[PDB]
Amino acid sequence: PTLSNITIRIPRGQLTMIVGQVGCGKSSLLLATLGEMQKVSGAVFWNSN
Numbered sequence: 001p002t003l004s005n006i007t008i009r010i011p012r013g014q015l016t017m018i019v020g021q022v023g024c025g026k027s028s029l030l031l032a033t034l035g036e037m038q039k040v041s042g043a044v045f046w047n048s049n
């Protein structure tokens with residue numbers, strides 16, 4: 001695994017400006033959010049209005 005223990009909840013209309021270092025899981029989360037990263041132990045349920 002290249003990422004774990006991600007516990008963030010964001011309702012709709014929540015502008016969440018992600019900041020971080022040079023290579024500390026910024027774009028990787030941006031891709032894993034869409035579903036392009038293999039998730040091993042994660043409870044994720046995307047839903048909309």
Ligand SMILES: Nc1ncnc2c1ncn2[C@@H]1O[C@H](COP(=O)(O)OP(=O)(O)OP(=O)(O)O)[C@@H](O)[C@H]1O
Binds near residue numbers: 002022023025027029
């Ligand atoms: N799609 C991917 N598949 C495999 N490894 C990835 C993927 N995307 C990023 N990585 C790797 O995971 C690590 C985390 O990188 P990260 O996602 O933080 O990069 P970044 O935010 O684009 O970087 P930077 O701050 O330099 O712009 C790096 O070693 C990177 O090479």
